[PDB]
Design a protein around this ligand. Structure first.
Ligand SMILES: CCCCCCCCCCCCOC[C@H]1O[C@H](O[C@H]2O[C@H](CO)[C@@H](O)[C@H](O)[C@H]2O)[C@H](O)[C@@H](O)[C@@H]1O
Length: 173
């Protein structure tokens, strides 16, 4: 899309990006909570840093989910620019509609950005949101992204889980 993204920022600069997994030497420890009625997702192709899925979905083939990704950025990386370009990805979604570009936030004591809204996929309105947390540590900038997605009618399920995540997550570099 026409919006500059974090991926564009990485591509256009002398920045190395490497995926991070639980237990990797040199990486932060991120304790995400598992809200009630949600179940933990292990690390997989579809949940690179794990995630959570709602255990009482209206459509078991399309349940509300919050998936985590953790990346390690080294080189000519400015943590403030990661936050600056965080809204680009969602804003490029087909028919995305949200309240502006989102807002600043914090998670586990680190600076973050969150935006949410709706988009249309296969003729169905979906609620989507992304929280990006910048974690400068150990000669690198780690970037955590939490990607929430659900059918429009299950928007409140996502919002409830988000409050639990916002209040209980700890991040220790
Ligand atoms: C921690 C994991 C990630 C974070 C937790 C996940 C929480 C997700 C909650 C996200 C709910 C965000 O959606 C809120 C709403 O945004 C848009 O409306 C807003 O923007 C429109 C165009 O500017 C205005 O016309 C509307 O008045 C204004 O409400 C969509 O059109 C709505 O359909 C959607 O409901």
């Amino acid at each position: 899309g026409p919006n500059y993204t974090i991926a564009d920022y990485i591509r256009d600069n002398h920045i190395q990006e490497t995926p991070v997994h639980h237990g990797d030497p040199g990486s932060p420890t991120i304790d995400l909570p598992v809200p009630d009625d949600w179940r933990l997702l292990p690390e997989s192709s579809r949940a690179p840093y794990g995630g959570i899925v709602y255990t009482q979905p209206a459509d078991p083939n399309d349940p509300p989910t919050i998936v985590a990704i953790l990346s390690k950025l080294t080189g000519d990386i400015d943590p403030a620019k990661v936050l600056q370009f965080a809204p680009g990805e969602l804003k490029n979604l087909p028919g995305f509609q949200g309240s502006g570009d989102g807002s600043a936030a914090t998670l586990g004591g680190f600076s973050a950005w969150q935006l949410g809204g709706s988009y249309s996929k296969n003729g169905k309105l979906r609620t989507v949101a992304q929280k990006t947390v910048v974690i400068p540590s150990q000669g690198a900038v780690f970037v955590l992204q939490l990607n929430a997605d659900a059918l429009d009618d299950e928007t409140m399920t996502l919002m409830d889980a988000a409050n639990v995540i916002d209040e209980q997550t700890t991040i220790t570099p």
